[PDB]
Structures are given as C-alpha cells and as structure tokens.
Amino acid sequence: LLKYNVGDLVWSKVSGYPWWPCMVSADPLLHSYTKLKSARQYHVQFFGDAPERAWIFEKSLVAFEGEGQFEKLCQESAKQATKAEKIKLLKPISGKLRAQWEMGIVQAEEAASMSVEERKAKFTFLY
Amino acid sequence: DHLLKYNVGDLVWSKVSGYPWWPCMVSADPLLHSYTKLKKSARQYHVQFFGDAPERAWIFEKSLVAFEGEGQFEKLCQESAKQATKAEKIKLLKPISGKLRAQWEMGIVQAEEAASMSVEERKAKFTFLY
Amino acid sequence: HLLKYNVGDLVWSKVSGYPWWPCMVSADPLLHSYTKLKGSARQYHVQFFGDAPERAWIFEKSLVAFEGEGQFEKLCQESAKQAKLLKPISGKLRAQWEMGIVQAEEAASMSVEERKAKFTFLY
Amino acid sequence: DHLLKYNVGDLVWSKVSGYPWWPCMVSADPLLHSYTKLKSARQYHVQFFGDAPERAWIFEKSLVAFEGEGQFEKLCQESAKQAEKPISGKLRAQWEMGIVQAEEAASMSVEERKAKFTFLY
Amino acid sequence: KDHLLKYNVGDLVWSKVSGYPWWPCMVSADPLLHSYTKLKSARQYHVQFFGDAPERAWIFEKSLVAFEGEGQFEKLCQESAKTKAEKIKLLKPISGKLRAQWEMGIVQAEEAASMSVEERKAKFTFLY
Amino acid sequence: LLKYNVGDLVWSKVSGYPWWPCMVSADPLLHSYTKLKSARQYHVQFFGDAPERAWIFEKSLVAFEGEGQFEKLCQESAKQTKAEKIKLLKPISGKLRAQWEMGIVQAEEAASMSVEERKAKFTFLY
Amino acid sequence: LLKYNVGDLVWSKVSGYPWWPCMVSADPLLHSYTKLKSARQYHVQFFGDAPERAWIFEKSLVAFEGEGQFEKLCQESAAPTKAEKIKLLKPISGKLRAQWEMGIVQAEEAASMSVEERKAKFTFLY
Amino acid sequence: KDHLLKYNVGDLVWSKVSGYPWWPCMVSADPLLHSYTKLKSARQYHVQFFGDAPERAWIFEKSLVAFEGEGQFEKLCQESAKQAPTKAEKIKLLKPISGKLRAQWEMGIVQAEEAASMSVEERKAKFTFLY
Ligand SMILES: O=C1COc2cc(C(=O)N(Cc3cccs3)C3CC3)ccc2N1
Ligand SMILES: O=C1COc2cc(C(=O)N(Cc3cccs3)C3CC3)ccc2N1
Ligand SMILES: O=C1COc2cc(C(=O)N(Cc3cccs3)C3CC3)ccc2N1
Ligand SMILES: O=C1COc2cc(C(=O)N(Cc3cccs3)C3CC3)ccc2N1
Ligand SMILES: O=C1COc2cc(C(=O)N(Cc3cccs3)C3CC3)ccc2N1
Ligand SMILES: O=C1COc2cc(C(=O)N(Cc3cccs3)C3CC3)ccc2N1
Ligand SMILES: O=C1COc2cc(C(=O)N(Cc3cccs3)C3CC3)ccc2N1
Ligand SMILES: O=C1COc2cc(C(=O)N(Cc3cccs3)C3CC3)ccc2N1
C-alpha cells in the first residue's frame, strides 16, 4: 500500500538542483527501495550520462508523466519557498548541468514508453 | 506480468539435457530485456543458473519446476528417469561429482538463501550482472 | 565498394567441429580491421552470437549472409554433401546456439547503425 | 545515414555554454543506440575527446566539421562576435589531450577510428 | 600482531577532514599498499568514506573517533567548534549533494554496525 | 574455536583434482567463511592465474606450510578403489600443471606475509 | 638520448596545483610516452587515490627523489606576478592535501622498487 | 639490473606447453607478483599467450624460442617430434591443429606479427593484457 514501487518514474527535488527525472530502485548494497526516517524515503537513481543515486523523502517526489510537468514543478516550488530561493528556483539551467538534465529527460521518456519489467531490465544502473 | 506462471525473481529448477536439475532464478535477458517469450505455441522463460560460475538460458516451461528446496531433487531425478532411452535412465540416477558437484552445491546454497528473502530483496541481491 | 561484407552485416560462420553459427561482422578490438587477406583469400572478423560470445577471423568461403533460422537445414545438408554434420546439436551448445539465433533475429530487425550500437560485444 | 550532414565516426567541434569549442566524435548513444534525433531541430550524439571522456546530445547549429586545431582561433573570434579568454589548468590539459586524440583519429579511415576511439560506457 | 592497535581492519570510525563534516568510515587496507596503519611519531589509519560515491584516505588517529551511531555527530561538531571563521563553518548544517551522500554513509555505517566484523568486511569493503 | 579463519592458507582436495593451494575467504555473496552442511565446511579460493572458489569440508582441508607437503598428501590420499589410487599418484601435466604451479607460487608468496597484508593482496575480487 | 623513460618518477607542475608526484607512462590510447609540440612533452600519471594523467612539458618536470624536494620546488616557483607568489607558497588543505599525501606515499613506495616492478605495480589501468 | 637476461618484458617468444602447439607469446610481468623472470637452478619467464582468449604462465627458458614470425612453426614442430623419445608423442606433435584451437592460434600469430612490427615500448603499451 506504498505510493511508489521499483521501476516507477519520479521527479526528485534536491536543494540546489532542478527537479530531476528519476526511477525508483533498490539500493545496490542495502537491497531496499523504501525506508522510514515517521517519514518515508525512496531510493532513486538520477537519469543521464553521469548517473547518481540517493534516498529521497516522498514529500520531494512527484510521479513522472513527461517533460511538460517541469514548468509547473518550478513555479510551485518557487511559491512554496525565502525571497532569494524563489529568484534562484525560476532561473533556467545552463552548461554541463543543462545537457545532463536533457539527457536524463530523454532516458526517462524512453523508459516511460516501456512496460515496468522491460525498463527495469534496460535502465537499472549497475553499481 | 500477474497472468504468467513465473515472474522475474521466481526460483525454479531447470533441466538441460546432460545436466542435473539445477537451482535457477527467473530473470530479464541482459540484452533482449524480456523474461518470457513464445517459441507462438510454447512458453520459455530466461533463467540464470545459480553458482560460483553463473550461466543463463531460455528454458521451456515444461523443463521448469517451482523451487521450494533441495529435498525436491531426489523426486525430480526419479521422475525424469521414469519419463526417459535405457542409457539416459542409468545416466540420470547417477550422483554428480568433482567440479560440477561443487558448483551445484554452491547454487543450492545461493538458492536457499534467496528463498529466505522477499522477491524484491532477492532480485536486488542475486541478480547476476552481465 | 568491392567487398561482399561490411561491419554490422549478419552472417553464418562455419568452424570445423561446430554447427553453422549466427554471427555479425565486426572490427578486431585490438587490430581495428574487419577484413584482411590471409597471404589470396579474404577473411572477415566475426563475433559469434550468444550468452558466451567469442570472435574469430573466418574465410569468406565459410561465410553465408544471414537471413534467418530457416537457412540452417540447407546449410547442414549442403556441408554434408561437400564432406556427423547431419546429427542435431544438444545440451549447453544447443542452448547457446538458440540464444545466438534469438540475438541475430533481433539484430536483423534493426537498422545496421542501431544493431552495431546494441550488439557489438565489448572487449 | 547517407542523407545527414554527419554520421557515426565523424569528427566535429562542439560548443557547450561555458566551455571552449571542443574536439568531439559523432557516436551512438550507449543506452538509446541512436546517433541523431529531431528536438524541428536536429541533434547529434557526440563524445568529447580527452583523458576524462564525456558525451552529450548537441544541436547541429553548435557543431562544426573538425579539420584540425588551426580552426579554434576563428571559431572563438566568430563565437565572441555573435555573443560579456584562453583556457588554463586541468581544462587546458584535457582540451590539449582531446586535440591530440582527435588529430590521431583524423589521420585514420572512419572504420578504424570507430574501432579505436569509440569510448566504452 | 594487530591485537595491540586502537583500531583494526573493519572497525567503524568517524573521520575529520578540514572543510568536511565528521564522516562515517570503516578502517580498511590500502588497495595498493596493503597496509591499514602506519607511522608518519604519529599513527595514521587507512579509511574508506561511506556513501554512494566512496573515497579513501590516510587519516591521523587524532582525527578518528570510534563510531557508535549518528547520535554522536552533534557532540563531535560542538567539540570541534570549541580560527573564528572555522567555528562558524563547522556548526553550519550540511546541504545539497553532500547532505545526501553523508546521509547515505550513515545508513551504510549503521547497517555495517548491526553486523559481526567478518561479515561487514565481506559486505562493505569497497573494491578499487 | 574454529580450526581455520579468513586468510589462512590450506590445501583442498576436490575429487578428480590434485591437492590445491588455497586461502580461506568469505563467500562474495553469502559473506560467511564457514558453515555446517553436523560436518563443517569452509569457503576457499583456489590459487592460480584462473581463480575458482568452493565450499570444502574440513576433512578435505590441510593447513598449508609449503610445496614439500604435496608428495605425502598424494601418498596418504592414495592409501585411503584400485583405479582411484593409480590416478591419484600420477603427476599432473599441461594446462593444469601450469595453473597448479602458479597457485603454489602465489601461496608461497602469501605465506611470506602477515595475515592482514595477504588478505589485502591475494583476496580475489568477485 | 631522452631525459626520461617509462617508469621514471617525476614532479609535475600544472597551473593552480602544487608540484605533484608522478611516474612517466605510455598514453593508454596513443601508446607513446614522449612527443614534440619543437618542445618535448612526456605523458605522466598523477599519483593518488583518484589518479589522473596528462601530457606535460619537460620544462614543468623535475626528477623525483623524495618529499624533501617539495619546499625548494615551491620557493623556486614563487613567478613575476605578486598574487601568484602569495598563492604558490600557501600550504594545501582538505581533499587535495589528502590526495597529495596519498600520491607521495605511493611515489616513495614506487621509488623503493626496481623500474620493472614499479611499472608492473603502479601503472594505472585505463 | 635487467640488461643481463636473454629475454626482457615485451620480447616476443614461442612457448611450448605439453599437449599444445608452439604458441605466439609476449614476455610480461606477473599481474600479482610483478616479476617477469625467476629461478626454479633453472630460469623461467612469465609469458602471455596471444589470442582472443588470453592466458599466462611461468615457462622454463628451455621451452622458449625468440619469435621472428609464423615461418618458424614448421621447424619448431619437426625439432620437437625428433627430441620426443616416445613414439606416440611424435605422431601427436606433427598433427595439424583444428577447430577452436586452430582459430585462437591463428588469432595469436596475427597479434604477434602486429606486435613484431612495433618498437618494444609501443607493443608493451598496446598488447599487454589487463588482469
Ligand atoms: O547525468 C546526471 C544524472 O545525475 C546527476 C546528479 C546530479 C546531482 O548532483 N544531484 C544531487 C545528488 C544528491 C545525491 C547524490 S547526487 C541530483 C540532481 C539532483 C548532478 C548531475 C547529474 N547528472
Ligand atoms: O556455477 C555454475 C552455475 O551455472 C552452471 C551451468 C552449467 C551448465 O552448463 N548448464 C547448461 C547450460 C545451458 C546453457 C548455458 S549453460 C546448466 C546446468 C544446466 C554448468 C556449471 C555451472 N556452474
Ligand atoms: O554463446 C556462444 C557464442 O560463441 C560460441 C562459440 C563457440 C565456439 O567454440 N566456436 C569456435 C570458435 C572459433 C574461434 C573462437 S570460438 C564457434 C561456434 C563456432 C562455442 C560456443 C559459443 N557460445
Ligand atoms: O577529457 C575531457 C573530455 O570531456 C570533457 C568535457 C567537459 C565538459 O564539462 N563539457 C560539458 C558537457 C556537456 C555534457 C556533458 S559534459 C564539454 C566541454 C564541453 C569538461 C572536461 C572534459 N575533459
Ligand atoms: O559518498 C561519499 C563518500 O565519500 C565522500 C568523500 C568526500 C570528501 O571529499 N572527503 C574528503 C576526502 C579526503 C580524501 C579523499 S576524499 C571526505 C568527507 C571527508 C565527499 C563526498 C563523499 N561522498
Ligand atoms: O588457476 C587455477 C585455480 O583454480 C583452478 C581450479 C580448478 C578446478 O576445477 N577445481 C575444482 C573446483 C571445485 C569448485 C569450483 S572449481 C579445483 C582444483 C580443485 C581447475 C583449475 C584451476 N586453475
Ligand atoms: O589522487 C589524485 C591524483 O591526481 C590528481 C590530479 C589532480 C589535478 O586536477 N591535476 C591537474 C590535471 C591536469 C590534467 C588532468 S588532471 C594535477 C595535480 C596537477 C587533482 C587531484 C588528484 N588526486
Ligand atoms: O587465445 C588463446 C590464447 O591462449 C590460449 C592458451 C591455451 C592453453 O591452454 N595453453 C596452456 C596453458 C598453460 C597455462 C595456462 S594456459 C597454452 C597454449 C599453450 C589454449 C587456448 C588459448 N587461446
């Protein structure tokens, strides 16, 4: 009766980073995909050419449908945020990070076009 | 997926001609990314053979039996021998030796540890990287 | 423009003591060439499809363009007439041969560039 | 493939905002297995040459066919006029390493350079 | 004989590197030099930093504290804080990528602590 | 109170193979080095250029001191089936003789080291 | 008649970094260890827990004897620019100090070995 | 230091292992022990066997011959069969290699001949097998 399961596509918010396309996965060492810290976390892998992973709170996850959600996610996170935080959040990503974000989105949209089992077999990053 | 006999992470015994019934786990093809196919008229599942030197194959459902534990192996042998050629029966009942006996034993140890786990955890621990 | 095969082309290869095997023409990971002349008679570097991949320099005379599994029967009967060969493969080798066929038929359903990017075995 | 400006193995200079024009090679995505796509505007997948290789989907407008190092000065002066400094340290070394790899790759037939310089991922 | 040093291979410690928070670590052998401790008059131990992006270093014994759990971190910070700029920096709570990796390390160290030293060595020794 | 511990050098006997230079190690997956199958087993790594690993019974392990033990191990195993004895005393050849030799060279180099150092140098990665 | 050869231990200077313990090695892709750019360069590998590599000019290389040279290298490098001198003499800290220290430890162990043995142990795989 | 031995790291040799044909090899350091030669009264060298499935071994100097090219293989076989006092050993030695082993032997020769066309430093950097 949990909201997300292994293979589910999510957007994750990490402070200092834009909403990033992710996939819920098992921790390569701890072999769990969700845990309690009173507050639920899920283990995610960040999509793109330089993959990363983290334990992200459910409050910082939104179900991924496509790229078109990103604008609303920014404007909603800006309205919920400190005067300096809002001006920082609405600012568009550039350079290396813009390319990697774009690469992530391309991988996530390709993953979305697949059945959960097939995308787990293709897009689960090996560690 | 909820409609097939087996799913990714399920533990099965696989029979390959010339080999004993082997402890396996149903898994995604590392290249083709499918775990089952029709060869439609006959279903196959992609399995990984447990042990210190892992292998993988597409095995017909007719050659798969749900894994419960080591105690099933004797019945599987005696049933396969009764279903089998005069030379095939004498070969099937003969107990495994050397390198293959060790690797079979190692597989059994891995399968029994995998069986003591929830499907999600065993997929995350026992899925062999290729 | 004069070679019969190019990198990414799907072929059947015959190695003495083995059945006609589903392969793909590839570059040598060290020598970086896909074809050479042994001496008068052309060879191509191929990768044998399956769960346990291998590679070799095979003579053009031992290569046939891969269309699908349906060719295997004729390849056997033709090799037998030119010569054990007619006897069907079993055990581990039958499984690996089957796995190769499955990989080759998936590779055949793809554009040459995509199949090179997906099925070129890393060494 | 015979209809696009670039193909797998072609050497190009790539411009990424905040980075100098970089010696690259057109290649297939190691995951998606495509080398070009449309986003109305064509992109090509490239690998950045060097001792620490990277890769990206770059628009055709930000790619220039690589001939040699001698082009870099003009590319900078043209990119400055269209747009408010010479590279140093770690980045200067890695850029230099890319030039060395790209110029070696340019001295080879497309098939051989694909077999030698395609970065494994 | 190893039974004479304060720490041994597999022991869980907190390590302090200037500009970084007290980090959950395990004492391990150098993957190249194959030693876990050395003298520089002053003893050092080779450690691995726990997390999703593992690192390693030769850290002085003076900068190591035996790991019991996360609850020690607050005292370690307040004691390290007690240079004017260094104190204001030390007491400040970690954010972004580093906070996530620190959290991942703690999760790994607390799992490792729930194990016998032989098992934790076999599970948590990072390959190099 | 166990006879062997992680890093200990042993000779292992597997039916159809000569007594082989090994090291007691933790299973890369199960993370245990010993188990009870009433009869104790230890997880070992076979030394050589093509390393292998297995769960071997304590009855089939002998503490490794050096190569000089091999002759006695053969003659004792032979004394312990008529065909099995003639096979056991026969000296190894080809690929297997080379790999056995490579194992002994690695084991003797491992023996010249403190247990911690040999664990850090000779534990095969899986 | 080249000053350096594969396996030789040197100090390399890269702008914005302290003199770093290296070892001359062949380029893992281009298979050359030296080239001319007029001015000779050597391919070096930077010692440490996070190894790197580069083509460094001979003018920015000094034969490595030991850590004791570092102080003189700094004071000699300390640069017509007033800001450059104050930044060069300043001691390294944090992550970089640890990795520099790890490099020195590796270079001094490499120095205690014959060239062939150190090439077989310390050549970083790529 | 290493200027007095017959072979050095990077040198191309043919190696004879009982039950196998004379094989194209390169003298290399042991990936673990980091030595390329040792005494067992009799000198051995660490070699890597060329081919698509590389192997390595410590081979006695008596079983090594400096590699010049493929053309030497016939004489090496003829010399080996003449030195082999056993009647069965001679008939086995002169027999030509087949199947998988013939292909891998061929692949080794192709690699060794490429390696021979290079300076010792370059061939060490290109053909030293990673372990
Ligand atoms: O290709 C990629 C994918 O992953 C990235 C993560 C990051 C990245 O730094 N983060 C923050 C992290 C938290 C835990 C570890 S990483 C994520 C964006 C939120 C930066 C660039 C990346 N590039
Ligand atoms: O560690 C292990 C696990 O896998 C093995 C498979 C085999 C083994 O050969 N097989 C047959 C195969 C089918 C196709 C590829 S392999 C399986 C027993 C039925 C032998 C030894 C093994 N040792
Ligand atoms: O999955 C696979 C793919 O490759 C194989 C090759 C072989 C196999 O042994 N060969 C012969 C070879 C010649 C050169 C190297 S290998 C090829 C079939 C003709 C056996 C099993 C395999 N299984
Ligand atoms: O050796 C190398 C090669 O690649 C590099 C890329 C970069 C580098 O950061 N970039 C920007 C990127 C966009 C997408 C991913 S990386 C490229 C120069 C434009 C920096 C240093 C490198 N060093
Ligand atoms: O997942 C992880 C684990 O290791 C890290 C180390 C560091 C990190 O940078 N350090 C400093 C180092 C000294 C020697 C090499 S690295 C350690 C915290 C003190 C940063 C992020 C990490 N993330
Ligand atoms: O370099 C090496 C080291 O390991 C080997 C094991 C074997 C080898 O086959 N065995 C039997 C095995 C039991 C379990 C898995 S392997 C061991 C000798 C007893 C053969 C050759 C080897 N070569
Ligand atoms: O463990 C290590 C070893 O290598 C490093 C290089 C560097 C490092 O960044 N450099 C500069 C480089 C030039 C070419 C590529 S890298 C070298 C010190 C001069 C930083 C940290 C390192 N840590
Ligand atoms: O591609 C290759 C290269 O190496 C091989 C070695 C062997 C091979 O088995 N040997 C014997 C060995 C002794 C020590 C380890 S291996 C060598 C030929 C004499 C067989 C096939 C090979 N294929």
Side-chain angles (χ1 to χ4, degrees), chain A residues 2 4-37 39-57 60-64 66-70 73-74 78 81 84 89 92 95-97 99-101 103-104 106-115 117-119 121 123-125, chain B residues 2-4 6-36 38 42-60 63-67 69-73 76-77 81 84 87 95 98 100 102-118 120 122-124 126-128, chain C residues 1 3 5-13 15-37 39 41-59 62-66 68-72 75-76 79-80 83 88 91-117 119-121 123, chain D residues 2-4 6-14 16 18-36 38 41-59 62-66 68-72 75-76 80 83 86 88-89 93-113 115 117-119 121, chain E residues 4-5 7-40 42-60 63-67 69-73 76-77 80-81 85 93 96 98 100-118 120-122 124-126 128, chain F residues 2 4-36 39-57 60-64 66-70 73-74 77-78 83 91 94 98-100 102-114 116-120 122-124, chain G residues 4-12 14-34 36 39-57 60-64 66-70 73-74 78-80 83 91 94 98-116 118-124, chain H residues 5 7-39 42-60 63-67 69-73 76-77 80-81 84-85 88 93 96 99 101 103-121 123-125 127-129 131:
Chain A
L2 316 157
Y4 308 112
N5 206 340
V6 184
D8 285 352
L9 303 178
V10 295
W11 289 101
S12 305
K13 185 66 184 73
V14 177
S15 187
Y17 294 97
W19 278 97
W20 208 275
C22 294
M23 187 182 80
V24 179
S25 45
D27 194 289
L29 255 176
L30 313 168
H31 308 130
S32 57
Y33 69 102
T34 189
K35 74 187 172 77
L36 294 165
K37 195 186 159 56
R40 183 155 305 280
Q41 286 180 302
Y42 285 93
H43 184 258
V44 303
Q45 58 173 53
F46 300 87
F47 280 114
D49 51 295
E52 299 288 348
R53 63 181 191 94
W55 282 99
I56 304 295
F57 279 113
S60 297
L61 304 168
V62 171
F64 177 92
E67 203 193 337
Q69 296 174 284
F70 189 71
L73 290 163
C74 282
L89 269 155
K96 188 188 179 202
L97 204 72
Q100 301 199 315
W101 185 86
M103 180 73 73
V106 166
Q107 288 184 342
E109 292 190 324
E110 159 81 349
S113 84
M114 280 168 202
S115 77
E117 278 310 329
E118 254 203 292
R119 88 167 73 117
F123 288 99
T124 301
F125 296 140
Chain B
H2 69 297
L3 308 127
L4 308 152
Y6 309 113
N7 206 339
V8 183
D10 286 353
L11 301 182
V12 291
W13 290 101
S14 304
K15 185 66 184 73
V16 177
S17 193
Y19 294 97
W21 278 96
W22 207 278
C24 299
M25 192 189 69
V26 178
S27 58
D29 192 285
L31 256 173
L32 311 165
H33 307 130
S34 55
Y35 69 102
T36 189
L38 294 161
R43 182 154 308 278
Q44 285 179 302
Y45 284 96
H46 179 269
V47 304
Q48 64 182 48
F49 300 93
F50 280 111
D52 50 297
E55 309 282 10
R56 63 181 193 93
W58 280 99
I59 305 294
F60 278 114
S63 297
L64 302 168
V65 172
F67 177 92
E70 201 194 340
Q72 296 175 286
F73 189 70
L76 290 163
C77 282
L100 203 74
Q103 301 199 315
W104 185 87
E105 279 175 347
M106 177 75 70
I108 279 300
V109 166
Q110 289 183 343
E112 293 195 320
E113 166 75 0
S116 83
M117 279 169 202
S118 74
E120 276 309 328
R122 87 167 75 115
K123 261 140 70 156
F126 287 99
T127 303
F128 297 140
Chain C
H1 73 295
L3 315 167
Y5 308 112
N6 207 338
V7 185
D9 285 353
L10 301 181
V11 292
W12 290 101
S13 305
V15 176
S16 181
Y18 292 97
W20 279 97
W21 208 276
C23 298
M24 183 186 84
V25 180
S26 55
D28 190 284
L30 253 181
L31 312 171
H32 312 322
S33 56
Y34 69 101
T35 188
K36 73 187 172 77
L37 296 158
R42 181 154 307 279
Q43 285 179 301
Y44 285 92
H45 189 258
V46 303
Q47 48 161 73
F48 300 91
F49 280 112
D51 50 296
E54 300 288 348
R55 64 180 188 95
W57 281 98
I58 305 295
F59 279 112
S62 296
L63 302 168
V64 171
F66 177 91
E69 204 191 338
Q71 296 175 285
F72 189 71
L75 290 164
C76 281
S79 286
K92 187 186 180 203
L93 204 73
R94 193 186 128 178
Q96 300 198 317
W97 185 87
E98 279 175 346
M99 176 75 74
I101 291 291
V102 168
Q103 289 184 344
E105 292 187 323
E106 161 82 338
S109 83
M110 280 170 202
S111 75
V112 166
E113 281 308 330
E114 249 202 297
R115 88 166 73 117
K116 268 143 77 167
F119 287 99
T120 302
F121 297 139
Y123 303 105
Chain D
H2 67 300
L3 306 163
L4 313 153
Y6 309 114
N7 207 337
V8 183
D10 286 351
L11 304 178
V12 286
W13 289 101
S14 287
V16 176
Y19 293 97
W21 277 96
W22 207 277
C24 302
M25 190 192 71
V26 180
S27 44
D29 193 274
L31 244 320
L32 311 167
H33 308 129
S34 56
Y35 69 102
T36 188
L38 293 164
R42 182 154 308 279
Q43 285 179 301
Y44 284 96
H45 181 276
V46 305
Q47 65 182 46
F48 299 87
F49 281 110
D51 50 297
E54 301 287 350
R55 64 181 185 96
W57 280 101
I58 304 294
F59 278 114
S62 296
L63 303 168
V64 172
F66 177 87
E69 201 193 341
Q71 297 175 284
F72 189 71
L75 290 163
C76 280
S88 39
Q94 300 199 318
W95 185 87
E96 280 175 347
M97 179 73 72
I99 290 299
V100 177
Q101 289 183 345
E103 293 192 323
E104 169 64 30
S107 83
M108 295 170 83
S109 74
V110 166
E111 276 312 330
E112 255 205 288
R113 87 167 73 116
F117 287 100
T118 303
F119 297 141
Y121 303 104
Chain E
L4 307 129
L5 308 150
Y7 308 113
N8 205 338
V9 183
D11 287 351
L12 302 181
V13 291
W14 288 100
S15 304
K16 186 65 184 73
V17 176
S18 187
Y20 293 97
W22 278 97
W23 208 276
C25 298
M26 190 186 59
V27 178
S28 56
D30 195 283
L32 255 175
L33 312 162
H34 310 128
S35 54
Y36 70 102
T37 189
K38 73 186 171 79
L39 292 165
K40 197 191 158 61
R43 182 153 308 279
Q44 285 179 301
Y45 284 96
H46 182 275
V47 304
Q48 54 169 64
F49 299 93
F50 281 111
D52 50 296
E55 303 290 347
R56 63 182 191 94
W58 279 101
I59 304 296
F60 278 114
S63 297
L64 303 167
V65 173
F67 177 93
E70 201 191 341
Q72 297 175 284
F73 189 70
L76 290 164
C77 282
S80 286
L98 203 73
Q101 300 199 317
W102 185 87
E103 278 175 346
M104 178 73 72
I106 283 295
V107 166
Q108 287 183 344
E110 292 192 325
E111 198 54 47
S114 83
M115 280 168 205
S116 91
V117 174
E118 272 315 327
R120 97 161 70 108
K121 260 149 72 174
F124 287 100
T125 302
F126 297 141
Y128 303 104
Chain F
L2 308 159
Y4 307 110
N5 207 339
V6 184
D8 286 351
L9 301 181
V10 292
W11 289 100
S12 304
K13 185 65 185 72
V14 176
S15 184
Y17 292 97
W19 279 97
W20 208 276
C22 298
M23 189 184 68
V24 180
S25 59
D27 193 290
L29 253 180
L30 316 167
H31 307 129
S32 57
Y33 68 102
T34 189
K35 74 186 171 79
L36 297 162
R40 182 154 307 278
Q41 285 179 301
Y42 284 95
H43 181 256
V44 304
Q45 56 166 54
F46 300 93
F47 281 113
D49 51 297
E52 301 284 349
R53 61 185 198 90
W55 280 99
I56 305 296
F57 279 112
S60 297
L61 303 168
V62 173
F64 177 86
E67 204 195 336
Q69 295 175 287
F70 189 71
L73 290 164
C74 282
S77 287
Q99 301 198 317
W100 186 86
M102 177 75 72
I104 293 284
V105 166
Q106 288 183 344
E108 293 190 320
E109 161 78 338
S112 82
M113 279 168 112
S114 75
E116 278 311 329
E117 254 208 291
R118 87 165 74 116
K119 263 144 80 170
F122 287 99
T123 303
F124 298 138
Chain G
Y4 308 113
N5 206 339
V6 184
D8 287 351
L9 302 180
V10 301
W11 287 101
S12 304
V14 176
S15 185
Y17 293 97
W19 278 98
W20 207 276
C22 310
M23 175 180 87
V24 180
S25 57
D27 198 281
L29 242 193
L30 306 173
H31 306 132
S32 55
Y33 68 102
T34 189
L36 294 164
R40 182 155 307 279
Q41 284 180 302
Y42 285 95
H43 188 265
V44 302
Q45 49 167 68
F46 300 87
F47 281 112
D49 51 295
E52 300 286 348
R53 62 183 194 91
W55 282 99
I56 304 294
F57 279 113
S60 297
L61 303 169
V62 172
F64 177 92
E67 202 192 345
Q69 294 176 286
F70 190 70
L73 287 173
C74 282
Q99 300 199 317
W100 186 85
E101 277 176 348
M102 176 75 72
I104 294 284
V105 169
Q106 289 184 342
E108 292 193 321
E109 161 86 326
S112 82
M113 280 170 203
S114 75
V115 167
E116 278 311 330
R118 88 166 74 116
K119 267 144 60 161
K121 189 187 170 132
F122 288 100
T123 303
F124 297 138
Chain H
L5 309 150
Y7 309 113
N8 208 336
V9 183
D11 287 352
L12 300 180
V13 291
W14 289 101
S15 304
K16 185 66 185 73
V17 176
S18 191
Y20 292 97
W22 279 96
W23 208 277
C25 296
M26 197 189 54
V27 178
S28 42
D30 194 285
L32 255 179
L33 313 166
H34 307 129
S35 55
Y36 69 102
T37 189
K38 74 185 168 82
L39 293 162
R43 183 155 306 281
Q44 285 180 302
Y45 285 92
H46 180 270
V47 305
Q48 46 162 84
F49 299 88
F50 280 112
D52 50 297
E55 300 287 348
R56 63 182 187 93
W58 282 102
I59 303 295
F60 279 112
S63 296
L64 303 169
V65 173
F67 176 93
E70 203 190 339
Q72 295 174 286
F73 189 71
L76 290 164
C77 283
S80 280
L93 269 156
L101 201 75
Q104 300 199 317
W105 186 85
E106 279 176 346
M107 178 73 74
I109 272 295
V110 168
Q111 289 183 344
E113 294 196 328
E114 183 52 34
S117 82
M118 279 168 203
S119 75
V120 166
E121 279 310 331
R123 86 167 74 117
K124 264 146 78 167
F127 288 99
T128 306
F129 298 140
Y131 305 104

